[PDB]
Amino acid sequence: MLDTNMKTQLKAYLEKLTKPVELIATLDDSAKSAEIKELLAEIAELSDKVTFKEDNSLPVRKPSFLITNPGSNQGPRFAGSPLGHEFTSLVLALLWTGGHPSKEAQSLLEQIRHIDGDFEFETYYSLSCHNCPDVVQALNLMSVLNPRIKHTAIDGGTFQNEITDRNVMGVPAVFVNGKEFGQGRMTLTEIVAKIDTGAEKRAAEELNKRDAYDVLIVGSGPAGAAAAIYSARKGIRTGLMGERFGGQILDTVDIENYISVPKTEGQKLAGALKVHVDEYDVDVIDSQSASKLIPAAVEGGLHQIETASGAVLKARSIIVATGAKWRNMNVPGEDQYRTKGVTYCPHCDGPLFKGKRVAVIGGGNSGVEAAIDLAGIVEHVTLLEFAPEMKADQVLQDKLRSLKNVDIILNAQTTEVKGDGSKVVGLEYRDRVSGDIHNIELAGIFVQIGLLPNTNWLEGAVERNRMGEIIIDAKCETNVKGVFAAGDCTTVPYKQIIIATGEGAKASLSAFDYLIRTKTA
């Protein structure tokens, strides 16, 4: 029941068919079936691409027909008349099956193809209905895009039995796997929204779709945060990736040497840093770990960062600010009395133990210097050295032995940190030689065993010194063009917040100068 206008329009659209289409009907002896049979034969006459076949054995509605390709069973099924306002739905279904492209967003299309489970759709419409087409067309497009999705468009006029049995009052009305799905002017996008039930392991996939950065900062402590702020103020595309925004200052309490701020808290300062970063256009990526650096193969190319999560980020320039881990005694009492007698920084907490007795753990330059420093502030210092001798420079060793409020203990290994429920009161150690245990009364324990820069993931890529520190010049340049580094992970002689932030700022401006000089050529 096509008129001359419909037939001519179909001649035109079916010329855009690049693949053969087949129309497989399943029919009874009713007038409705004769109407569909006449229709399909008329559509087959308008193109040598379209073919009308019949199979009245199949267990489907009668009349109905499948729009598919030769040697296939994938495609949309019309049940009843696909004419009226559904005529464009019919035409579109032929084109799509025929290899003509969809007008939908390309991303949305791939989401249909890569879909998890089986869904059997069926929509109830009428020929008079104005809204039904968009729904039918949308679902039709899904069945064409992947065979796991099936769709059968029911004409209510033909199948009055179903719309009256299956209690639908309005059209369009959609069903899935038996269950009711929804009604009304559904878009394609919102149907794909309800159908996809996916959660985890998506973050990595979100990161590969990410565009290349002008600068990508790896690590989000004070150094990375400062670099991010200085970078985003130049208006360049700035990404700040880290494991845990805040870095080492998150697990500290009282900070009294961030210049211009007599006393703040670690958590508060980490929060302030975030606020300041968020003032500018900075793509902040949290809970991710750089696992590898792949340096660019050409000047003016892109460095790449691989994540433990499987993603790969890319950038014109990189700033490594991954900081360090400060080595622990690894003994009972240690964790419980951190910020509360157990400390890892003589520069930070030294002033707090005036008149108190303390221990330093470690007999290297760090430890021995620390003891000498503290010895001028505190009542008494005891240095515990694991080995039979201190590794520190001889000048420092001599200086420490010439102090009247200092005990050196060699072959000493800490076994326990002792407190009173809220604060340190003493220390337990083992003589490694005799095996004996001894106790020391004290208020503070300064752990100076060593620093482990978080840089082993860069082995081979950028040059490091013999301590794992990333080697840098005054401009924070590494041996790799367009890779910079800032803060504790680098060769900076001292490890502090105010120092780290300055370096972060330095590395940002050095990265920016690098970009200026590499964009034109």
Ligand X SMILES: Cc1cc2nc3c(=O)[nH]c(=O)nc-3n(C[C@H](O)[C@H](O)[C@H](O)COP(=O)(O)OP(=O)(O)OC[C@H]3O[C@@H](n4cnc5c(N)ncnc54)[C@H](O)[C@@H]3O)c2cc1C
Closest to a second copy by CB, 396 vs 443, is 396
Beta bridge partners of 188: none
* Total residues interacting with ligand X, rule: CB under 6 A: 36
Point out the annotated binding site for FAD: 214-229, 478-488
Residue 397's binding partner out of ligand X, a second copy, none, with CB under 5 to 8 Å set by partner kind: none
Beta bridge partners of 152: 77, 122
Strands (E), 208-323: 213-218, 238-241, 254-255, 264-265, 282-285, 290-294, 303-307, 312-320
299 binds a second copy (CB under 8 A): no
Torsion of CA 221, 223, 225, 226, to 10 degrees: 160
152 binds ligand X (CB under 6 A): no
Q: Which of 86, 122, 214, 243 binds ligand X (CB under 6 A)?
A: 243
Residue 68's binding partner out of a second copy, ligand X, none, with CB under 5 to 8 Å set by partner kind: none
476 binds ligand X (CB under 6 A): no
Closest to ligand X by CB, 10 vs 255, is 255
- Considering only residues 253 to 282 of the shown chain, the ones binding ligand X according to CB under 6 A are 255, 257
444 binds ligand X (CB under 6 A): no
Provide the CA 225 distance to its chain's centre, in angstroms.
18
- Considering only residues 381 to 440 of the shown chain, the ones binding a second copy according to CB under 8 A are 395-396, 398-399, 402
90 binds a second copy (CB under 8 A): no
DSSP H/E element including 400? helix 394-401
Residue pair 23/31 in contact (Cβ under 8 Å)? The answer is: no
Q: Residues near 120 by Cβ (< 8 Å), separated by ≥ 6?
A: 150, 152, 176, 177
Residue pair 64/152 in contact (Cβ under 8 Å)? The answer is: yes
The letter for the amino acid at 87 is: F
Q: Which of 6, 127, 331, 377 binds a second copy (CB under 8 A)?
A: 377
Closest to a second copy by CB, 178 vs 262, is 262
Pairing of strands 357-361, 444-447: parallel
CA dist list (Å): 229 to 42, 106, 267, 512: 68, 35, 19, 13
348 binds ligand X (CB under 6 A): yes
Q: Which of 76, 84, 156, 222 binds a second copy (CB under 8 A)?
A: 222
Residue 326's binding partner out of a second copy, ligand X, none, with CB under 5 to 8 Å set by partner kind: ligand X
The CB-side HSE value for 410 (13 A sphere, CA atoms) comes to 8
Provide the CA 376 distance to its chain's centre, in angstroms.
49
**Tokens describing residue 501:** 């932030």
343 binds a second copy (CB under 8 A): no
341 binds ligand X (CB under 6 A): no
Q: Residues near 29 by Cβ (< 8 Å), separated by ≥ 6?
A: none
**Tokens describing residue 28:** 């009874």
182-221 mask for a second copy (x: CB under 8 A)? ----------------------------------------
Angle 208-213-219 (CA atoms, 0-180°, nearest 5)?
Answer: 85
Residue 98's binding partner out of ligand X, a second copy, none, with CB under 5 to 8 Å set by partner kind: none
499 binds a second copy (CB under 8 A): yes
Using DSSP, state whether 41 is helix, strand or coil: helix
Point out the annotated binding site: 214-229, 357-371, 478-488
Residue pair 272/283 in contact (Cβ under 8 Å)? The answer is: no
66 binds ligand X (CB under 6 A): no
* Total residues interacting with a second copy, rule: CB under 8 A: 60
Q: Which residues bind ligand X (CB under 6 A)?
A: 218-224, 242-244, 247-249, 251-252, 255, 257, 289-290, 321-324, 326, 344-345, 348, 454, 457, 487-488, 495-498, 500
Name the residues that contact a second copy, by CB under 8 A. 222, 225-226, 229-230, 233-236, 256-262, 269, 272-273, 275-276, 279, 347, 350-351, 369, 372-373, 376-377, 395-396, 398-399, 402, 474-475, 491-494, 496, 498-506, 509-510, 512-513, 516-517, 519-521
